[PDB]
Amino acid sequence: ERDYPFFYKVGDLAGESNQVRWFLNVNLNKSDVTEDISIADRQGSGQQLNKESFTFDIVNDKETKYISLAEFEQQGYGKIDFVTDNDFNLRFYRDKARFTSFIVRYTSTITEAGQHQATFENSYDINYQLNNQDATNEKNTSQVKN
């Protein structure tokens, strides 16, 4: 099994025209967690977040599920909060995140100004805590070449 970071984010320009496909890769190695996982996401310029595009690829040693944002929340996995049109906070509750990976897929529409950018960016601040470890806080910015 490949050794992935607890969290990483990437994107590409595959599929739909004038859209950026983003991916939030959470706990791919299915480690245990001692608290909720909280992501504060601030999207870069030249993009308009498609708030209805979110899907969740959830996997553990019991089952594989691909659900919508509404289902993600209805089933007790977590909650999202769109704080602006392009910024959102996403939380994964402790219990269902234990030994479970989440690949969150969503898109953003590329604006006229965005079409002329060299790259597309998305920044995040994530808080989480693993077993026998102190809480972790990571911040970074991912880029997609245009």
- Domain CATH for 28: 2.60.40.740
Torsion angle, alpha carbons of 54, 58, 63, 69, to 10: -30
Q: Which residues of 55-81 are buried (b: 16+ CB within 10 A; e: fewer)?
A: ebbbbbeeeebebebeebeeeebbebe
Q: Please, are residues 25 and 9 in contact by the beta-carbon 8 Å criterion?
A: yes
Distance CA 42, CA 45 (A): 10
Split into its structural domains, the chain has a count of: 1
Q: Please, are residues 113 and 46 in contact by the beta-carbon 8 Å criterion?
A: yes
Closest CA to 58 of 42, 71, 40: 71
Distance CA 139, CA 29 (A): 20
Determine the structural domain holding residue 67 and report its residue range: 1-146
Cα 98 to the center of its chain, rounded Å = 17
> Helix, strand or coil for residue 86?
coil
Q: Determine which helix (DSSP H) or strand (DSSP E) holds 112, and give its type and residue range.
A: helix 112-115
